[PDB]
Amino acid sequence: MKIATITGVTKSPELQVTKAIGALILSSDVALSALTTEKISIYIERGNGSNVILANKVLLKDFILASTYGTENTQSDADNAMIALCELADEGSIYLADKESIKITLEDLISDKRYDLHGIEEPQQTNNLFFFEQKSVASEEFNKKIDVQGFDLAIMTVDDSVSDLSYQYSNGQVVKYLPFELQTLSRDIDPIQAVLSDGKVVQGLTDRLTLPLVAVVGIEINKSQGSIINFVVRCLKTV
Amino acid sequence: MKIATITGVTKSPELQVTKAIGALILSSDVALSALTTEKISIYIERGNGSNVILANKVLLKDFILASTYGTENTQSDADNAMIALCELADEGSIYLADKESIKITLEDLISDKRYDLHGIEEPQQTNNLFFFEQKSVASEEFNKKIDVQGFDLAIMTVDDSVSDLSYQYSNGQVVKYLPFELQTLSRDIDPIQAVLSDGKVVQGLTDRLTLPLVAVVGIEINKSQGSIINFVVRCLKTV
Amino acid sequence: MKIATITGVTKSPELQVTKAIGALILSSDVALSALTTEKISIYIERGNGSNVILANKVLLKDFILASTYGTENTQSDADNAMIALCELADEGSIYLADKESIKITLEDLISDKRYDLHGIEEPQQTNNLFFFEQKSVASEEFNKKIDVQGFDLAIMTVDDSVSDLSYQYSNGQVVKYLPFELQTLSRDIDPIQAVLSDGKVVQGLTDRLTLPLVAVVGIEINKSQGSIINFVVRCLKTV
Amino acid sequence: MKIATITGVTKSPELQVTKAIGALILSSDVALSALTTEKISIYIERGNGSNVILANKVLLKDFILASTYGTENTQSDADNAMIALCELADEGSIYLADKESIKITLEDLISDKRYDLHGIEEPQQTNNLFFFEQKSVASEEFNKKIDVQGFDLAIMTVDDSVSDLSYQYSNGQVVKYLPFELQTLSRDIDPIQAVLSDGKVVQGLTDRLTLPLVAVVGIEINKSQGSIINFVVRCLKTV
């Protein structure tokens, strides 16, 4: 069902959903490439316990790209320049116990734009949920190793100062990759990334890269100074 | 083989095919979005028993859309502005006895256009066939229940007077959607509906909506008064 | 890794690859429709006797079209006008026994265009390899039968003289197709052949057609005199 | 044997050595104290397997200082202003197996300068090799503790922010040193670090310090905010 419509304000109010949903539809008149600083934060609140945080100030571009990788792609309309569907659980929907609800907030919005939220319910309830985490490589340092065991998808910020990537697999084999090779490998699973309103397609953003991780237990990044690199990693687990 | 080429008239001659075909190819110089009133009628004239009716004046837009849902789409050559492949059977082709035939006819054409029919033969024979049925919702009706048990695909005429549509599943849950929600959810299965000659792609017609029915046993329509809603449903069965 | 950057010459030198690779990346500033006479030759050199010939002076267009059939398609970029990923083995990379290495070369290049090779490494090794063969039908004859058993993919040249293409399957059934029917049927599996730089798509090349051979043991060509018809077939086998 | 000469370019091509060498001779017309940002990278390559990295983008000053500590020192001549010999194995040459080779590259050079590489081989072969690693202390942190167990040498960045540095020995005792005390103890073992072309000698550099770690299992560095501090450590292990 329709959740909220935000316009004319920089910060969206705390939105509460008491109905068990399975996915969220984000629709806005801002094109996906034009999104700059919008952030989202979704979690599950319990009456007599600690909250369960699924996302925490995740960038809208990273959230959309992580949630729409595969056969699907973000679409458009005559009135909305961006429509995306992002699922919060595998197969079924989220099971809500007593005194349990869902809370969604939006931050860093543009004054003269529009945003909408829609909730998508399912005929089933499941215990598996999606979590989003962030890993940063600082600008001052040169190389860094980050452990991505248990994750199945990552989003890299694309920059020209990054030179080398290293993948360590489960069987201990280490493979060397370049940004060009990584982009070409990424575009062999989901060729088209988005469809524009006028009819043209875009096969990938110029500042984000979607890395599918299978049997990967580590990522080493070799770069130079002057820029900060960010990874948005997605995982599935039972709460 | 080439069945017919029709131009200059408003009604097709009663065409007959004796060879066992499994699929039809409809080609025309009229774009997919420019089809208005053309209709098709297909039926197999059996010799031992009753005849088989596969399509009874089905509108050409819905006939094309109900067959090209999934990995495929309707294409366009440099000469023909619309080419579509529509299957009449499952896997193999239609099994025909010594003197049986398949009779096809077209109605409500345009005198300054051209329509071309092709038939595809297949190595195997089968008895399973696809049936296209038509359902209607009256102008004075408020809410209506339709049993879609056994079907797997429907096409509805998009109208502004339709408020809600509710899916009833096999296990007994009822989920109420919206037109926008249904469009978004259906666009994630076949993100591309057609490809134009100039290279632009179209992700969906603005006046038809395709609904895939998986484990769905009921459809409830809630709308206002003053319009007739049209559904074209496809089913697979053995005759 | 980086293999070669050929620019300013009409013939690339012999290139040796010592470590195991499983895929090549061909990149250039000429689009898929701008490749005319470029040829590629890949083989495996054994130190003490005999070589394994995978591809010998195969046209670059046919090599690219025989590898990117299916979900994938040839990519573009803001700098590279064509990128194509062609796998040289199934699943893993090519296993190398004692004292052998891969060797690649190019012929018939345009002296004012840029070509680049990249290699892809994998964490697995395999024995299966992809072999490419070429078949021809002369210009002074009318009909001819060719035997394609064991090949899973073929590429034929498209000419106006081709009238009928008869298939012969493993159960003995014979089906006669037309060029239009073949073109329509081949686009039901891969509807998009390439994605252009500006955001448009192309569903196929004008002079080349791709035929997937499943349960097919023979082909017959009925054509008029005037043009030589060329086939490039791909097979998978162990070495 | 001679490997390569570099002049004009800021980056060296990936240099391959197939003959088993045991030491590298680096020659340049810029004095040892004049090196600013030149980097070196060396690794052993297996044709079908994983590479064995010995040094990955190590500063040339640190590479030279970590190998010429003791009785030896970097020398010079009328033509070459800096000649340094760096050993890559324990007491023989690298034993290359069936398909291994050696790859060396140089990065971030100066356009108007000259660099020369030479290789030294000897009748003995061995498996023990020298590995180079790098450790860092952030520019915002006060007190840091690092582990140096198993390493036999370190090159630290001399900065005026350093106040205290305490060793921890294998018997449990902790001794605190100042920069002046550390420099004096370092020059107590190796008094002369280089001999200039004209005839003067230099005892050590103004920004790098060499620490021999004998029976030391931990280091604690106590400083103030302002800058990053780099350690380059070296170890010997069997491949």
Author numbering:
A (entry chain D), B (entry chain E), C (entry chain F), D (entry chain H): 1 to 239
Give the text the authors published on this PDB structure.
In this study, we report a detailed characterization of ΦCjT23, an icosahedral temperate ssDNA phage with an inner lipid membrane, isolated earlier from a strain of Flavobacterium (previously Cytophaga). The virion structure determined by cryogenic electron microscopy reveals similarities to members of the viral kingdom Bamfordvirae that currently consists solely of dsDNA viruses with a major capsid protein composed of two upright β-sandwiches. The minimalistic structure of ΦCjT23 suggests that this phage serves as a model for the last common ancestor between ssDNA and dsDNA viruses in the Bamfordvirae. Both ΦCjT23 and the related phage FLiP infect Flavobacterium species found in several environments, suggesting that these types of viruses have a global distribution and a shared evolutionary origin.
To address distant evolutionary relationships, we determined the structure of the ΦCjT23 virion by cryo-EM. Single-particle analysis of complete particles resulted in an icosahedrally symmetric reconstruction with an average estimated resolution of 4.1 Å. Within the asymmetric unit, type 1 trimers circle the five-fold symmetry axes at the vertices, type 2 trimers reside on both sides of the icosahedral two-fold axis of symmetry, type 3 trimers reside on the icosahedral three-fold axis of symmetry (contributing one MCP per asymmetric unit) and type 4 trimers reside between the rest. The asymmetric unit contains 10 independent MCP monomers, contributing a total of 20 β-sandwiches (V1 and V2). As these 21 building blocks are not identical in sequence (MCP V1, MCP V2, and penton domain of the spike protein), the triangulation is referred to as ‘pseudo’. The dimensions of the faceted capsid are characterized by a face-to-face distance of ~55 nm, an edge-to-edge distance of ~54 nm, and a vertex-to-vertex distance of ~63 nm. Inside, a lipid bilayer with a thickness of ~5 nm is discernible.
